[PDB]
Ligand binder design. Structure first.
Ligand SMILES: Nc1ncnc2c1ncn2[C@@H]1O[C@H](COP(=O)(O)O)[C@@H](O)[C@H]1O
Ligand SMILES: [K+]
Ligand code: NA
Ligand SMILES: [Zn+2]
Length: 180
DNA sequence: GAATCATAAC
C-alpha cells in the first residue's frame, strides 16, 4: 500500500479534520482520540512535522511546553467541573507517526480499553510524563528511553489507584468503578 | 465458555 495512506499516518489526516479538532492556535492542534482509553482523551499535535520524540531537540523545547499548557487549558475548558484527575504524557514507543501528547482522564472508563497492552501503555513507565520529557530535553538535549519498554506491556494488571492486582480486563473494569 | 495469547493483515 501507499505511504500516505498507511495506517501509521492516520493522525496526519485527523489533525486536519475540522470535525475532530477541538482547539487550534499558531503552533498546535488538539483532536479527540479516535479510540479513547477513558472518558476524556485528547491528543495535542504540533502543526510542524516531527516524526516522534526521537527527532526532538532543544529547538523544540518551547513547543513541548506549549503543547503541555494547551493540554491543561483543554482540560479546564472541557472538563473543569468534572472531579477527574488527568495525566499528560507520551508513549515511550508510539505506533502512530507525528509527535502527539496524550491528555487523558484517570477513570479509564472506556469500551476501547480492551487488553493488557492498552492498560500498561498508560500505567507503567511506558507512559512518559510530559513534564519528564520536557525536563529531559532541557537538561540532556534529547529524549532517550531505556531498553525493555515492550516487556512492560505484558505486566500483570494492577489498579493505578490502590495497587490491587486484577486477573483480567473485565475484572479490572469492574474494580475501577470503586474509584469513580 | 470466557478471556488471553501471539500472529497476521500481500
Ligand atoms: N485517525 C486517528 N485520529 C485520532 N486518533 C487516533 C487515530 N488513529 C489512532 N488514534 C489514536 O492515536 C493513539 C496512538 O497511540 P500511540 O502511537 O501509542 O501514541 C491511540 O490513542 C489511538 O487511539
Ligand atoms: K492464553
Ligand atoms: Na505498536
Ligand atoms: Zn483500585
Amino acid at each position: 500500500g501507499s505511504h500516505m495512506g498507511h495506517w501509521s499516518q492516520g493522525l496526519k489526516i485527523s489533525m486536519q479534520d475540522p470535525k475532530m479538532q477541538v482547539y487550534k492556535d499558531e503552533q498546535v492542534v488538539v483532536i479527540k482520540d479516535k479510540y479513547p482509553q477513558a472518558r476524556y482523551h485528547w491528543l495535542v499535535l504540533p502543526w510542524t512535522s516531527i516524526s516522534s520524540l526521537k527527532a526532538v531537540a532543544r529547538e523544540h523545547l518551547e513547543l513541548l511546553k506549549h503543547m503541555h499548557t494547551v493540554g491543561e487549558k483543554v482540560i479546564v475548558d472541557f472538563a473543569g467541573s468534572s472531579k477527574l484527575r488527568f495525566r499528560l504524557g507520551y508513549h515511550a514507543i508510539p505506533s502512530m507517526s507525528h509527535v502527539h501528547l496524550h491528555v487523558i482522564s484517570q477513570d479509564f472508563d472506556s469500551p476501547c480499553l480492551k487488553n493488557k497492552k492498552h492498560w500498561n501503555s498508560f500505567n507503567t513507565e511506558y507512559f512518559l510524563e510530559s513534564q519528564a520529557v520536557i525536563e529531559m530535553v532541557q537538561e540532556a538535549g534529547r529524549v532517550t528511553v531505556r531498553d525493555g519498554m515492550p516487556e512492560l506491556l505484558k505486566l500483570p494488571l494492577r489498579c493505578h489507584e490502590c495497587q490491587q492486582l486484577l486477573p483480567s480486563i473485565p475484572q479490572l473494569k469492574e474494580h475501577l468503578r470503586k474509584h469513580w
